[PDB]
PDB file of C-alpha atoms and ligand atoms in Angstrom:
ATOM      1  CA  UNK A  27       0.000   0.000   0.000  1.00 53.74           C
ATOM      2  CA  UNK A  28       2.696   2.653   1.010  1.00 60.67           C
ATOM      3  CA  UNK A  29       6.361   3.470  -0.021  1.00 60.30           C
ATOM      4  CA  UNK A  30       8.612   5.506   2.160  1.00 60.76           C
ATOM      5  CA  UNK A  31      11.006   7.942   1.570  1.00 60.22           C
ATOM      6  CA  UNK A  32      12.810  11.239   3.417  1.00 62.28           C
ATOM      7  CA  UNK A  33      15.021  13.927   2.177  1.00 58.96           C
ATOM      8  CA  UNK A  34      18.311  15.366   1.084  1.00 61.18           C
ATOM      9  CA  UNK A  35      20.478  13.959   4.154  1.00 64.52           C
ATOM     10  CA  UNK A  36      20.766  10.029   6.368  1.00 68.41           C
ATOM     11  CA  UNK A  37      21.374  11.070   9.920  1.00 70.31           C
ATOM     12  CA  UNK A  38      22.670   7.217  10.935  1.00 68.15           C
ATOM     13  CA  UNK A  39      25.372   7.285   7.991  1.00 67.35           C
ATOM     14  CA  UNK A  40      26.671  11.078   8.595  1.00 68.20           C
ATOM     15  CA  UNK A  41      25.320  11.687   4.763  1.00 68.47           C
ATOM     16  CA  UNK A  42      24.027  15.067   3.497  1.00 69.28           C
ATOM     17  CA  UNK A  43      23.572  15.682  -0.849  1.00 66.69           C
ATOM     18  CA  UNK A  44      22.854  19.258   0.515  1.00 66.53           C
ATOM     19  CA  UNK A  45      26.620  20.254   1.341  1.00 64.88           C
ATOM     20  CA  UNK A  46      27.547  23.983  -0.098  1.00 67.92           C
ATOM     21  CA  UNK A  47      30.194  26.888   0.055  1.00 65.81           C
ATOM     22  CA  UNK A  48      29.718  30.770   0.818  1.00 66.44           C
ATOM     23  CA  UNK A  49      29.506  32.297  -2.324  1.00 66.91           C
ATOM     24  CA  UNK A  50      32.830  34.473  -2.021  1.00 68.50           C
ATOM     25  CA  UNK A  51      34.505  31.356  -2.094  1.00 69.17           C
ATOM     26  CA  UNK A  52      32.656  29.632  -5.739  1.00 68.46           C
ATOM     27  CA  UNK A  53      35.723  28.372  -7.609  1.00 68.49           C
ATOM     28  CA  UNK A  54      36.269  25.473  -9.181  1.00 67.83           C
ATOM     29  CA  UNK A  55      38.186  23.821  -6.956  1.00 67.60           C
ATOM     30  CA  UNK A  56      36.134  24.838  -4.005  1.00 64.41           C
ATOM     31  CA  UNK A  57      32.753  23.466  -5.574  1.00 63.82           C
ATOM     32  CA  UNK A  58      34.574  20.160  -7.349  1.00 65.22           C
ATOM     33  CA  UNK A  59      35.465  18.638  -3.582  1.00 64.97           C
ATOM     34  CA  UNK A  60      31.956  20.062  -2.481  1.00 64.33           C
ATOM     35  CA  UNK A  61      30.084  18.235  -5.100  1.00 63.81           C
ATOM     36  CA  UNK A  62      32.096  15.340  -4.787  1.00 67.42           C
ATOM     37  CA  UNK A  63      31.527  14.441  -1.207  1.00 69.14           C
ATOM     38  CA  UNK A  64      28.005  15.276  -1.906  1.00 66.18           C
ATOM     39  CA  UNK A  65      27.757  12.789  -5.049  1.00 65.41           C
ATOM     40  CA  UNK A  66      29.560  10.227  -2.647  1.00 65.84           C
ATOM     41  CA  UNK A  67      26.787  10.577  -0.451  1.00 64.66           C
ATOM     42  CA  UNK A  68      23.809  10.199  -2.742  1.00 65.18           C
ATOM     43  CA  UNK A  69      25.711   6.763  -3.455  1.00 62.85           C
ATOM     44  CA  UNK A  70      25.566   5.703   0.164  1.00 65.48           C
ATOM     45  CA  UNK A  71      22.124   6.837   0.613  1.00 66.01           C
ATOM     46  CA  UNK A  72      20.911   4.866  -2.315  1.00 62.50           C
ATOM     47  CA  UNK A  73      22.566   1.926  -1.363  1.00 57.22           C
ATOM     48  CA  UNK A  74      21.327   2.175   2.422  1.00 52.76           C
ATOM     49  CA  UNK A  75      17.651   2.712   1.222  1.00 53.25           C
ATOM     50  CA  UNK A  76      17.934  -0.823  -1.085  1.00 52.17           C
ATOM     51  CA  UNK A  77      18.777  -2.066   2.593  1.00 52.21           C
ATOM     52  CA  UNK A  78      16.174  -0.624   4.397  1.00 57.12           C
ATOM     53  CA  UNK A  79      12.828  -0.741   2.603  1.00 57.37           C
ATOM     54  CA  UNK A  80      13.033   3.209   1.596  1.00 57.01           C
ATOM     55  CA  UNK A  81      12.045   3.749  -2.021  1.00 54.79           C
ATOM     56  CA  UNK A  82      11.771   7.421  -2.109  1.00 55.75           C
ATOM     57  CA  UNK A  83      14.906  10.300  -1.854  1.00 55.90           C
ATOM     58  CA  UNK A  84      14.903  14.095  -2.055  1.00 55.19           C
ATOM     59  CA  UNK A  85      18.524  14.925  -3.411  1.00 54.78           C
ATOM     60  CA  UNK A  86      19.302  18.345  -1.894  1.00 52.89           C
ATOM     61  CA  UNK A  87      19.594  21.790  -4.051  1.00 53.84           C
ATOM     62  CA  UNK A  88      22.958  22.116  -3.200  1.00 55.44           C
ATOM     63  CA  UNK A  89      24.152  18.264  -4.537  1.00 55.36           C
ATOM     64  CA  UNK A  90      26.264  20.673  -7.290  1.00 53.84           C
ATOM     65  CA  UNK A  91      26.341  23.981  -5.056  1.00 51.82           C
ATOM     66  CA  UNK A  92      25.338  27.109  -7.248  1.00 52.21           C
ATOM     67  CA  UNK A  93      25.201  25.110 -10.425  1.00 49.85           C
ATOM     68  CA  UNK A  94      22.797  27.860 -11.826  1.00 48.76           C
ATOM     69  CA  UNK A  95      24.211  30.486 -10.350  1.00 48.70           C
ATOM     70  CA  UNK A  96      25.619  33.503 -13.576  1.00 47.94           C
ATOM     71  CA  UNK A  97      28.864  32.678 -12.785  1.00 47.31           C
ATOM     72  CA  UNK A  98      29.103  29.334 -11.851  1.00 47.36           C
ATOM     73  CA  UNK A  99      32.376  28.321 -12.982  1.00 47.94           C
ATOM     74  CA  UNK A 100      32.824  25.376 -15.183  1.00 47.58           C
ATOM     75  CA  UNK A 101      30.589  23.220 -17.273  1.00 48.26           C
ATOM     76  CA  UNK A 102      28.978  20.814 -14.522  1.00 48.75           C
ATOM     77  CA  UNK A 103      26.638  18.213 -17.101  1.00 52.23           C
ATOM     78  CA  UNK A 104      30.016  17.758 -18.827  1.00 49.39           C
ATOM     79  CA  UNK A 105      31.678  17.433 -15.693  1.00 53.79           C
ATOM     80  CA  UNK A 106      29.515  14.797 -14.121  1.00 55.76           C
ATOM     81  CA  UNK A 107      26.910  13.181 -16.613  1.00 57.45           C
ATOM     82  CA  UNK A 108      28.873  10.123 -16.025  1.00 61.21           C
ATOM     83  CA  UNK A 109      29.018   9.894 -12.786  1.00 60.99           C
ATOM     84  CA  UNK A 110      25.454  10.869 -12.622  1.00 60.76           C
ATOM     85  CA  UNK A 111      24.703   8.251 -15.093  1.00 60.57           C
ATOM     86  CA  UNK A 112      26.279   5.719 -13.078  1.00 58.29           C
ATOM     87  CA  UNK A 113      24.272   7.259  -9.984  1.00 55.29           C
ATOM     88  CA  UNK A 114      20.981   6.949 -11.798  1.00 55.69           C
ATOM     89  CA  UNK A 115      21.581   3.496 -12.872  1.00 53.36           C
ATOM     90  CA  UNK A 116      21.700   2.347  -9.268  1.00 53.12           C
ATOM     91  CA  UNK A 117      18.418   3.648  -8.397  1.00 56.07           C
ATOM     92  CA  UNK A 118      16.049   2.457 -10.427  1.00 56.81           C
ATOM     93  CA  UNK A 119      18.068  -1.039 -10.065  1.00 55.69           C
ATOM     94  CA  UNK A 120      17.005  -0.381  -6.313  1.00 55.85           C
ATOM     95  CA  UNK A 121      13.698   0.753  -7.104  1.00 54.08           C
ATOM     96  CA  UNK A 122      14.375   4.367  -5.721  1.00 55.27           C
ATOM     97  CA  UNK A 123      12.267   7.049  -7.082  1.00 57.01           C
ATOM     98  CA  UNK A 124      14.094  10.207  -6.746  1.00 58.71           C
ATOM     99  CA  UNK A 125      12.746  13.984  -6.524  1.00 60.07           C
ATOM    100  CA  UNK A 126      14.008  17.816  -5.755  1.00 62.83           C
ATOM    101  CA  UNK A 127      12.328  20.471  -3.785  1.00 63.65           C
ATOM    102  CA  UNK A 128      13.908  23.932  -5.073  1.00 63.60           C
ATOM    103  CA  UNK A 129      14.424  26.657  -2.152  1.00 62.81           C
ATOM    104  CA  UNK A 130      12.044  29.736  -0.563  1.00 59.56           C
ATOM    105  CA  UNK A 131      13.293  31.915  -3.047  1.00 58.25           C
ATOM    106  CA  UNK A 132      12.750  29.999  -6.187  1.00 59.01           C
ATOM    107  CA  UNK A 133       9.298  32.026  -7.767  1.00 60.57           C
ATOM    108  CA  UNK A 134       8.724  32.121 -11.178  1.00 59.78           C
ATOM    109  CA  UNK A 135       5.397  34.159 -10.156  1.00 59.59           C
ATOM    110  CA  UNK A 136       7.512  37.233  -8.711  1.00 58.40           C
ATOM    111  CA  UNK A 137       6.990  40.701 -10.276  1.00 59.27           C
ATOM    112  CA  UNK A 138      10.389  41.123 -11.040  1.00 58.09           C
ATOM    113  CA  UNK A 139      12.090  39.629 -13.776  1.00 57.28           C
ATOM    114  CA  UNK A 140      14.896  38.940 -12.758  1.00 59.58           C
ATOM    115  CA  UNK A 141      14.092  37.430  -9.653  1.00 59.54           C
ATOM    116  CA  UNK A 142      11.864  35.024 -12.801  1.00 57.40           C
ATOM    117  CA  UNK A 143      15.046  34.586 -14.537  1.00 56.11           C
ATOM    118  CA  UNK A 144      17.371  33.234 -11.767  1.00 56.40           C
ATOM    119  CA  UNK A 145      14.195  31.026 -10.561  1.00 58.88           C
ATOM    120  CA  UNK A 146      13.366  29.339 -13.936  1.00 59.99           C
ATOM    121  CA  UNK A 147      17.491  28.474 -14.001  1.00 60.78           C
ATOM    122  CA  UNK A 148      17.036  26.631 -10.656  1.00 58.74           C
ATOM    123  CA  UNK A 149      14.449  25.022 -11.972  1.00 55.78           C
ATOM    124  CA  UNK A 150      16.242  24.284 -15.187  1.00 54.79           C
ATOM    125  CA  UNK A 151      18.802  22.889 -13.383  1.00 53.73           C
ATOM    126  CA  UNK A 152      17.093  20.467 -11.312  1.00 54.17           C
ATOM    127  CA  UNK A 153      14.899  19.427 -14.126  1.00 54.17           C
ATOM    128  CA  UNK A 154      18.353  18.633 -16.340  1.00 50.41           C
ATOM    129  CA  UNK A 155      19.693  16.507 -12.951  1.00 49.68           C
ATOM    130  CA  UNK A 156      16.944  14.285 -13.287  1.00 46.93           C
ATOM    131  CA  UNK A 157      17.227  14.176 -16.625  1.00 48.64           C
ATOM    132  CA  UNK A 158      21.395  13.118 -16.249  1.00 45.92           C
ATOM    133  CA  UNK A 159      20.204  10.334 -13.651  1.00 48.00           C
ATOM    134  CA  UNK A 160      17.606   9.201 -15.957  1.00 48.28           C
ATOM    135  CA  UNK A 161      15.152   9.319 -13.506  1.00 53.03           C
ATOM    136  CA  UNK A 162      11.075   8.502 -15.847  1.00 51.22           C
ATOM    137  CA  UNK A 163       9.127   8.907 -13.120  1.00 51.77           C
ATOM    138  CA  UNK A 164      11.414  11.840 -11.406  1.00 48.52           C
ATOM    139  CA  UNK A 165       9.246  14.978  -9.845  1.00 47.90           C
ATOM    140  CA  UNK A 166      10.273  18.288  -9.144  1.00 48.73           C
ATOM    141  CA  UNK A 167       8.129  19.877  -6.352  1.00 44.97           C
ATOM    142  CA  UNK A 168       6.986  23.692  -6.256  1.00 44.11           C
ATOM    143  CA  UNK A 169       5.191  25.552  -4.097  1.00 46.74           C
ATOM    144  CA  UNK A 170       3.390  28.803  -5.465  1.00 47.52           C
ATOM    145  CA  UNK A 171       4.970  31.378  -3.879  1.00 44.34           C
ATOM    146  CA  UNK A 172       4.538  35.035  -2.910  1.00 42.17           C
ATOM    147  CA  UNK A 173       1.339  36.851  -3.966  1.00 42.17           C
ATOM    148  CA  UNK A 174       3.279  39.886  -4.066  1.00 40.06           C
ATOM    149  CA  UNK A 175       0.261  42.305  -3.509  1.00 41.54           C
ATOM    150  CA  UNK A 176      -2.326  39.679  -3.845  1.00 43.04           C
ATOM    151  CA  UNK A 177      -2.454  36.753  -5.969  1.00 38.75           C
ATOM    152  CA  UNK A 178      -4.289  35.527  -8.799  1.00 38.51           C
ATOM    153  CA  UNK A 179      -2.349  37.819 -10.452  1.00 38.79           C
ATOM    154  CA  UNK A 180       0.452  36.214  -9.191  1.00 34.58           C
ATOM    155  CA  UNK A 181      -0.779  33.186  -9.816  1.00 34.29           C
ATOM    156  CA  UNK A 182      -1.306  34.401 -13.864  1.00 34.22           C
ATOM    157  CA  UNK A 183       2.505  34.858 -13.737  1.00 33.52           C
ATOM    158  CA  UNK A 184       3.887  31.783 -12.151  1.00 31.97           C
ATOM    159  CA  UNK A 185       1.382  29.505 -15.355  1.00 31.40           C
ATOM    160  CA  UNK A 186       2.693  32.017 -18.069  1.00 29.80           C
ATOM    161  CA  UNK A 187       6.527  31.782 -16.572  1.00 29.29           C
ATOM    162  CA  UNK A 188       6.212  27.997 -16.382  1.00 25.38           C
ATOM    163  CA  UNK A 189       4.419  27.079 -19.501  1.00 24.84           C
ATOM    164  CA  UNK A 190       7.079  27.425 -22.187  1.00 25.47           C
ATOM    165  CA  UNK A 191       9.692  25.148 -19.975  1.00 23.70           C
ATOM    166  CA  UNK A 192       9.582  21.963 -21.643  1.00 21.61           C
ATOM    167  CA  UNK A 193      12.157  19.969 -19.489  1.00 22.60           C
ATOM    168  CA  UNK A 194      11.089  21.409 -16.184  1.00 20.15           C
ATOM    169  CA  UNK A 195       7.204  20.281 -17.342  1.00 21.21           C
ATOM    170  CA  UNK A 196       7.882  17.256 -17.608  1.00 25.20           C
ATOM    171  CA  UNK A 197       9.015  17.017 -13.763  1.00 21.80           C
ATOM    172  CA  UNK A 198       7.331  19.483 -12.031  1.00 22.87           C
ATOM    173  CA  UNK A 199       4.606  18.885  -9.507  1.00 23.82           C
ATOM    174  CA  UNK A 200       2.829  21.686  -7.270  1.00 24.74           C
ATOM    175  CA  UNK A 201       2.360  21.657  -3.189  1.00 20.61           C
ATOM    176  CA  UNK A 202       0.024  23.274  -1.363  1.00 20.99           C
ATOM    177  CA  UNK A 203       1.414  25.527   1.500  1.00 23.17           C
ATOM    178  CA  UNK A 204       0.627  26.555   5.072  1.00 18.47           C
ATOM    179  CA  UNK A 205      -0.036  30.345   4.224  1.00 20.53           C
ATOM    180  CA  UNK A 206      -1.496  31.450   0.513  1.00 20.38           C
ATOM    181  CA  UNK A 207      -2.508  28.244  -1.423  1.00 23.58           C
ATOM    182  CA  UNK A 208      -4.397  25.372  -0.338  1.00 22.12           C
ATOM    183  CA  UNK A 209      -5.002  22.171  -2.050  1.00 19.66           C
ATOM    184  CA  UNK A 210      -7.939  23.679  -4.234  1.00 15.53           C
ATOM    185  CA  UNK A 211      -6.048  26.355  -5.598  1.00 14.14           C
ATOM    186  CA  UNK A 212      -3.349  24.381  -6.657  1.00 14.42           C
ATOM    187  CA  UNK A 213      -5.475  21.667  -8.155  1.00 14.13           C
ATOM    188  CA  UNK A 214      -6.420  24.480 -10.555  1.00 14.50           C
ATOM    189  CA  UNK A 215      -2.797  25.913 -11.486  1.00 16.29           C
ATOM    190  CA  UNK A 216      -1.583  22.347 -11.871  1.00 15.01           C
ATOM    191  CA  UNK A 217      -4.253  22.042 -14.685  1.00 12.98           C
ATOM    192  CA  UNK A 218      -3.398  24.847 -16.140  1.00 12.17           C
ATOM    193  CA  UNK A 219       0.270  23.667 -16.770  1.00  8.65           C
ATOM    194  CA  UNK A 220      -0.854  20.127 -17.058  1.00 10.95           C
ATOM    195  CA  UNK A 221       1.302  19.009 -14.465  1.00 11.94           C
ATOM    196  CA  UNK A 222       0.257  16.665 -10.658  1.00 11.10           C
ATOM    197  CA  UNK A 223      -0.103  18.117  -7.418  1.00  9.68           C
ATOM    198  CA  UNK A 224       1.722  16.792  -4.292  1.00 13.59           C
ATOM    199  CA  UNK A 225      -0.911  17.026  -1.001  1.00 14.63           C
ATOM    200  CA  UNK A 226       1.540  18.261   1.648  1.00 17.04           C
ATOM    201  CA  UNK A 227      -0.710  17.210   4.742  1.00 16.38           C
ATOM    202  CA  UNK A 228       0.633  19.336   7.415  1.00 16.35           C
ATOM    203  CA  UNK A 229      -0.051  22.294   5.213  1.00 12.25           C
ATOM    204  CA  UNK A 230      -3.221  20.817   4.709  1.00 15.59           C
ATOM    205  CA  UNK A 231      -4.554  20.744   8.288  1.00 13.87           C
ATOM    206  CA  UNK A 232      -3.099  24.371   8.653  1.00 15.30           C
ATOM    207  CA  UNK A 233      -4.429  25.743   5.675  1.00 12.34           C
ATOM    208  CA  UNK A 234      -7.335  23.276   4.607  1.00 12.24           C
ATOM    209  CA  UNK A 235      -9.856  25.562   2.392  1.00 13.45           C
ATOM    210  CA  UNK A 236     -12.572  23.257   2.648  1.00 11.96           C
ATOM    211  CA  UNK A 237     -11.717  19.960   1.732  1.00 10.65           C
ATOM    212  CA  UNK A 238     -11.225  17.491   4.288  1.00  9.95           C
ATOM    213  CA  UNK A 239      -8.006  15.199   3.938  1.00  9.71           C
ATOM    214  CA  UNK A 240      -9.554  12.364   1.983  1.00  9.25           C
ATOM    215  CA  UNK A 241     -11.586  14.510  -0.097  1.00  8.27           C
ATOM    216  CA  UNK A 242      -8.108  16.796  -1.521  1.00  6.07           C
ATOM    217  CA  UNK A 243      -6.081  13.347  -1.724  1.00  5.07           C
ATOM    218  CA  UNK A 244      -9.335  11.828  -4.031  1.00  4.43           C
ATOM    219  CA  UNK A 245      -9.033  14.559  -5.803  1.00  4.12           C
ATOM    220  CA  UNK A 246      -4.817  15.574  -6.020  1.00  2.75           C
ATOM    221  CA  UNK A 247      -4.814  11.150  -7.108  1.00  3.20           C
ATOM    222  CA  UNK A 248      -5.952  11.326 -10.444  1.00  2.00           C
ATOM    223  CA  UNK A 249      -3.458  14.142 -11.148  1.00  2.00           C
ATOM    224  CA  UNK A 250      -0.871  11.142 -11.538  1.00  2.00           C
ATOM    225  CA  UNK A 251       0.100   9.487 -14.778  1.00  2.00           C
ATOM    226  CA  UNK A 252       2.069   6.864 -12.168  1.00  2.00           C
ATOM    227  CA  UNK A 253       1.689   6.658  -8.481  1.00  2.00           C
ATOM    228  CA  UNK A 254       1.098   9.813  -6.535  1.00  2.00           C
ATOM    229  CA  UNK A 255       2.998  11.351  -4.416  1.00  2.00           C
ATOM    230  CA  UNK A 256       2.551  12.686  -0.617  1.00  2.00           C
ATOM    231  CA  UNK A 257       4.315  14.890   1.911  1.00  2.00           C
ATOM    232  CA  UNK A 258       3.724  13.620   5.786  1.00  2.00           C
ATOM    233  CA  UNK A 259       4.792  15.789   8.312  1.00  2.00           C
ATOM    234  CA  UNK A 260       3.647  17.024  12.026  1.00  2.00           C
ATOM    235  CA  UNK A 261       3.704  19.882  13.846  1.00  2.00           C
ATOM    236  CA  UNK A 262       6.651  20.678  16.166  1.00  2.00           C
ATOM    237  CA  UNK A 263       4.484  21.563  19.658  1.00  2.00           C
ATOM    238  CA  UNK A 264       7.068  23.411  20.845  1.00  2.00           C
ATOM    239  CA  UNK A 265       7.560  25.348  17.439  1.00  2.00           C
ATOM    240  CA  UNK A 266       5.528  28.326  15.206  1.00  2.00           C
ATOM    241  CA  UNK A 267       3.138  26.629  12.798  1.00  2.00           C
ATOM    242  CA  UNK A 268       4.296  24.618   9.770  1.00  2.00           C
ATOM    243  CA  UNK A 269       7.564  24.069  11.980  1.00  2.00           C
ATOM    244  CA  UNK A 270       8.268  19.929  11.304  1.00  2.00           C
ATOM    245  CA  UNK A 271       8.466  17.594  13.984  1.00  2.00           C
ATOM    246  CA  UNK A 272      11.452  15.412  14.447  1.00  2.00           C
ATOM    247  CA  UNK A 273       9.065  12.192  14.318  1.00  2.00           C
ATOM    248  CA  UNK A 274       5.729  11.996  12.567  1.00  2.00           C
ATOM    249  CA  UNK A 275       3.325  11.142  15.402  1.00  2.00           C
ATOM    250  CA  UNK A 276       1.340   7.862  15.318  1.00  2.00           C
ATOM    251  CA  UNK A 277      -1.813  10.355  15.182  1.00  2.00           C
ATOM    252  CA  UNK A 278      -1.034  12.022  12.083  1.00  2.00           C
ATOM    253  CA  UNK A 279       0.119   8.431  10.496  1.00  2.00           C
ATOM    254  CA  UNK A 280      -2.934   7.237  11.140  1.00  2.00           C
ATOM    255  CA  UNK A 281      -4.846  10.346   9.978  1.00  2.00           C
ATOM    256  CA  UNK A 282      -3.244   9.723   6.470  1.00  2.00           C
ATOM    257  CA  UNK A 283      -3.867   5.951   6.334  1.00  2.00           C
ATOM    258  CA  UNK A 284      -7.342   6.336   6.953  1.00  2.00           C
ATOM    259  CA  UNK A 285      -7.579   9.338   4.293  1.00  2.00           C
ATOM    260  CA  UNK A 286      -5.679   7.021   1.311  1.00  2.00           C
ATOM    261  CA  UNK A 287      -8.024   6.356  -1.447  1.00  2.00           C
ATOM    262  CA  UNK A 288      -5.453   4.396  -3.002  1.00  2.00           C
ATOM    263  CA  UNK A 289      -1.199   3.570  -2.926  1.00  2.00           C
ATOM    264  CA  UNK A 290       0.900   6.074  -2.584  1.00  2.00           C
ATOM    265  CA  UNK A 291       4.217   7.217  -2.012  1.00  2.00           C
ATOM    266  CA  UNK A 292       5.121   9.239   1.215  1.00  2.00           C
ATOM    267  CA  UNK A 293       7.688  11.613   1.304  1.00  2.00           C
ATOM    268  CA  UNK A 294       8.167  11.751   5.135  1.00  2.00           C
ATOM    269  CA  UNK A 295       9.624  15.451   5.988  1.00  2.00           C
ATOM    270  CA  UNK A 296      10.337  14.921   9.727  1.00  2.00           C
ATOM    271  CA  UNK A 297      14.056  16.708  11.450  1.00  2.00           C
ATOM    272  CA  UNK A 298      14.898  13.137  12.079  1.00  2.00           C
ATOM    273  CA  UNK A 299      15.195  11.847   8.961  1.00  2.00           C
ATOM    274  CA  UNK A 300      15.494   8.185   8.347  1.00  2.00           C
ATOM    275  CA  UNK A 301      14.526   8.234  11.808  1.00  2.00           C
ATOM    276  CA  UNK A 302      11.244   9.914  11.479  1.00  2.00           C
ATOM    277  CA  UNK A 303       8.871   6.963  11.280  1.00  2.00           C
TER     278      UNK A 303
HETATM  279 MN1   MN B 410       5.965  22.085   6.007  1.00  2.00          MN
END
């Protein structure tokens, strides 16, 4: 019935895709070793998932650091589409299904231009990974974003900015978010573009509209050419909402069993990683 998964870093095996470098700092050299010990670690994650029945990883932004950044400093596809290749090649022969989630400031719905510009290149670039690792059934997961002023608007922006990218299209997936979009407004974005829609469930019980659970997973389902996807989290009590948990609590497991209308693969997003059953 369910699939597992958690992202970017293993806290047993000390092993983080997400390392980076201050940006005063990018040279080639610098960002080579960086990537490397990073590309080491996807390895080891991979390989301690096929031993562990997790069939799901997040690769960090940073697993090249900057690699879209204007003056990143060498050719990185020519640098490691083999070793990416080779990296690819081991996960689907482990049955991993692998996925990015691009940073806060990645908006292709933003007023300004060039705030577009640099956003669409992160996306680029994490669309082209996938691509590298050969990963079919890869997704590349969005949230919506700013409504700088208010959106709809905004939201007019982020389908326009979004529609032309061909590569990115045929990753992307949207999430619905604690603040500005809940699962009903995304469910009509992703249509727009054509593309699924990730139900984030934390963000759903703090910003539900008004579907219940089951009734936004019924309909987010369909969405999926293969088998959808799902983000399970839980509040931090200690923490300001949307905060994550360092364990999902039995409660919200539960409360997303019951919901499933059909299989599904959970991305668990808890501090504790691996852990965070
Ligand atoms: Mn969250």
């Amino acid at each position: 019935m369910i699939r597992l998964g958690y992202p970017c870093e293993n806290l047993t095996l000390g092993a983080t895709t997400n390392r980076t470098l201050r940006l005063a700092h990018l040279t080639e050299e610098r960002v080579r070793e960086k990537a490397a010990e990073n590309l080491r670690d996807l390895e080891r994650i991979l390989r301690f998932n096929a031993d562990h029945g997790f069939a799901l990883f997040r690769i960090g932004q940073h697993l090249i650091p900057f690699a879209s950044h204007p003056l990143f400093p060498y050719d990185w596809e020519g640098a490691y589409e083999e070793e990416l290749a080779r990296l690819g090649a081991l996960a689907r022969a482990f049955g991993q299904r692998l996925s990015m989630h691009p940073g806060q400031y990645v908006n292709p719905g933003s007023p300004d231009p060039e705030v577009v510009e640099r956003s669409l290149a992160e996306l680029r670039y994490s669309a082209r990974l996938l691509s590298l690792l050969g990963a079919e059934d890869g997704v590349l997961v969005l949230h919506l974003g700013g409504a700088y002023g208010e959106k709809g608007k905004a939201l007019r922006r982020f389908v326009e900015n979004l529609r032309g990218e061909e590569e990115v299209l045929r990753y992307l997936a949207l999430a619905n978010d604690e603040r500005l979009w809940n699962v009903e407004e995304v469910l009509k974005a992703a249509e727009a573009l054509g593309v699924p829609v990730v139900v984030d469930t934390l963000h759903h019980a703090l910003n539900p509209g008004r579907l219940p659970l089951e009734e936004a997973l019924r309909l987010a389902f369909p969405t999926w050419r293969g088998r959808p996807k799902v983000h399970l989290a839980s509040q931090d009590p200690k923490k300001r909402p949307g905060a994550h948990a360092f364990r999902v609590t039995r409660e919200d497991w539960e409360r997303l069993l019951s919901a499933l209308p059909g299989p599904a693969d959970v991305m668990v997003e808890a501090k504790g990683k691996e852990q965070g059953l």
